[PDB]
Amino acid sequence: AMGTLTPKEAELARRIRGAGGRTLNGFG
Amino acid sequence: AMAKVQVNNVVVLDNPSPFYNPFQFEITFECIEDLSEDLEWKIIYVGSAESEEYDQVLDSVLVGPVPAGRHMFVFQADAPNPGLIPDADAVGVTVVLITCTYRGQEFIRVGYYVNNEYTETELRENPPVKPDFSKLQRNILASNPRVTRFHINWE
């Protein structure tokens, strides 16, 4: 059962993805 | 079709450190095709998760010239102004962003989570009513770089 982000975690995740991008773990 | 620049790595230097310490990043990228314009790099501190209003652009640099090849530069920027950070966001997790822009278009966004914490057990358990930034340690979660690329026009 997959977990969920808190409003702060979710806000920070959205900043990290910028204009709707796919966020990856590292550079390649 | 191919992006003319790809970022290969970022190394976070001098970490953990005091909150007041400059951010220091070794940034490596490859240019597969000569650029006619400069690359614009920014470090943006997220002062408050709730609102983008509280962003602080810690520095903005023009990098160049950019001929085809493998490049590295060290990007350093002063710590954010604590007078603009909401007290409630000061202690705990926030984010710093490194961004690169070509001809006004942002093609990459690197994010790190940042845990700002007291190191003295007294303060950690009984934290000051208003944050004491001279006593906060910045720990950038360097083992988890978050990387987001965007399709832009390289012409």
Amino acid identity of residue B78, one-letter, is D
Resolution in Å equals: 2.0
- Checking DSSP bridges between strand B39-46 and strand B55-63, what pairing results, if any? antiparallel
Q: Which of B11, B13, B6 is nearest to B29 (CA)?
A: B6
> What are the distances in angstroms from CA B88 to CA B44, B68, B151?
19, 46, 36
Do the chains contact at A25 and B111, CB–CB below 8 Å? no
Angstroms from B13 CA to nearest CA on chain A? 17
* Domain B1-155 CATH class label: mainly beta
- Please give the Cα distance from B43 to B112 (Å, whole number): 11
Domain ranges of chain B: 1-155
- Please give the Cα distance from B19 to B32 (Å, whole number): 37
Question: Running DSSP on this structure, what letter comes out for residue B121?
Answer: H
CB contacts, 8 Å: B147 with chain A: 23-27
Structure-token pair, residue B79: 């710590």
- Please give the Cα distance from B73 to B39 (Å, whole number): 12
Do the chains contact at B109 and A18, CB–CB below 8 Å? yes
Query: Which distant-in-sequence residues (6+ apart) come within 8 Å of A12 by Cβ?
Result: B46, B49, B93, B94, B95, B113
DSSP per-residue string spanning B66-100:
--SEEEEEEEEEPPP-GGGS-HHHHSEEEEEEEEE
